[PDB]
UniProtKB/Swiss-Prot annotation, chains A, B:
Pfam families: PMM. It comes from Mus musculus (Mouse). Pathway: Nucleotide-sugar biosynthesis; GDP-alpha-D-mannose biosynthesis; alpha-D-mannose 1-phosphate from D-fructose 6-phosphate: step 2/2. GO terms for molecular function: metal ion binding; phosphomannomutase activity. This is Phosphomannomutase 2. Involved in the synthesis of the GDP-mannose and dolichol-phosphate-mannose required for a number of critical mannosyl transfer reactions. CDD domains: HAD_PMM. It catalyses: alpha-D-mannose 1-phosphate = D-mannose 6-phosphate. Belongs to the eukaryotic PMM family. The lineage of its organism: Eukaryota, Metazoa, Chordata, Craniata, Vertebrata. GO terms for biological process: GDP-D-mannose biosynthetic process from fructose-6-phosphate; GDP-mannose biosynthetic process; GDP-mannose biosynthetic process from mannose.
């Protein structure tokens, strides 16, 4: 219990958007013997129960849903944080208002709804709306590649809100992610600083620079290990802890 | 000379957002020996299936999801319509653009997410955002009762879009409904015009002004009866159809 194996949820412990296989769930309780285990993902405590199980807080020594902004230690809640509590209501409104007014001046073939999805760890801004069909989603992506609308919107966002502690990125085919600096998976690491672990082994699939693991994989405080699929994840752990 | 009994769903055939009972499911099919039956509700066809059954189109002579904009008759799809097809993407965006700019200017205590929900038959525009917590809804509704934010907005919309054949009604505590004229429950009546039904009885539970049944209930093409629950719906039909 001097080590911690910090696993990522999708592409690592389960199949993307899927329920963990009973076998994998077995190996994680087998490894729990030699090291403390934990899960982190940009998924709320519910999706973590749909995929890992309602007893997720009991099957791990650390549960870090929403990249740790919501956190648990030893089955007992540790703390909770939100972008409204960090940035303040005023700045939250100044960002929303800028994005709303910006999206209103973009000429598209189609606009729909849910242009601003509010989450406790991030705002998901889409010029078309996250309620668009799949055909309409593609239409925007293809046109985005040629016209570079999302890229221009990211640039204006970084200039408007310069030195406000925010990170803007292009996310997927139609959206733009907004979150305070360091609120990626690396936020879960602040709940482990004073626990003093010799090594925190992190495990994830998006180690690519531009992925949702890169920052925690490249972070000094972790020994990153890239995994292609849950079968790979259990392999590496078999050697590290024989 | 046939007759038709048109039923609202939530609060009239089923309990709110719940599954129909078998006594009501068997009552309606017993009743089909005396008159044709149909169901109309705001929900999409998928929620109608969940609550009334998977064989819904085989059990009701008429199924009118989304207030009839999707219509089914005798188990075969009649026709489908949507706001973007009646108004056009041109105007859909003119509406969405105005509401976004407007909302970006409303000074509120808090703003969150889902400021515009796109549905096939309407747009739900909320200054605060329809993804806010209870305690947030109430905070806004209280302020709304004191500064009339939604009413000022409704009045500005009616002027900006007068002549485009739209209707701006206040809904719930935080939202403003936007739909083409006639696109309430009365819309389904068009599919029953040339049927020649001697009498079209209607049953609903929110028949007062503001309820989603008031328009179809007061429409002269219908003989309306107000119900309190599926048990009352039964009672009235036993009298009308001995
Ligand atoms: Cl929105
Ligand atoms: Mg992943
Ligand atoms: Mg590292
Ligand atoms: Mg109803
Ligand atoms: Mg009437
Ligand atoms: Na009236």
């Amino acid at each position: 219990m001097a080590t911690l194996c910090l696993f990522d949820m999708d592409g690592t412990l389960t199949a993307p958007r899927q329920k963990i296989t009973e076998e994998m769930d077995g190996f994680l309780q087998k490894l729990r013997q030699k090291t403390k285990i934990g899960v982190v993902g940009g998924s709320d405590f519910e999706k973590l129960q749909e995929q890992l199980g309602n007893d997720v807080v009991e099957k791990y020594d650390y549960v870090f849903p929403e990249n740790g902004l919501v956190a648990y230690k030893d089955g007992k809640l540790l703390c909770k944080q939100n972008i409204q509590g960090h940035l303040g209501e005023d700045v939250i409104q100044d960002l929303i208002n800028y994005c709303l007014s910006y999206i209103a001046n973009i000429k598209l073939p189609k606009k729909r709804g849910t242009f601003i999805e509010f989450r406790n760890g991030m705002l998901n801004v889409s010029p078309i709306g996250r309620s668009c069909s799949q055909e309409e989603r593609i239409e925007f992506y293809e046109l985005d590649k040629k016209e570079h609308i999302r890229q221009k919107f990211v640039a204006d966002l970084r200039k408007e809100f310069a030195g406000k502690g925010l990170t803007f990125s292009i996310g997927g085919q139609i959206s733009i992610d907004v979150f305070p600096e360091g609120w990626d998976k690396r936020y879960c690491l602040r709940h482990l600083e004073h626990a003093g672990y010799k090594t925190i082994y992190f495990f994830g699939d998006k180690t690519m620079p531009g992925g949702n693991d890169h920052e925690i994989f490249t972070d000094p405080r972790t020994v990153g290990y890239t995994v292609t699929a849950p079968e790979d994840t259990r392999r590496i752990c078999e050697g590290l802890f024989p």
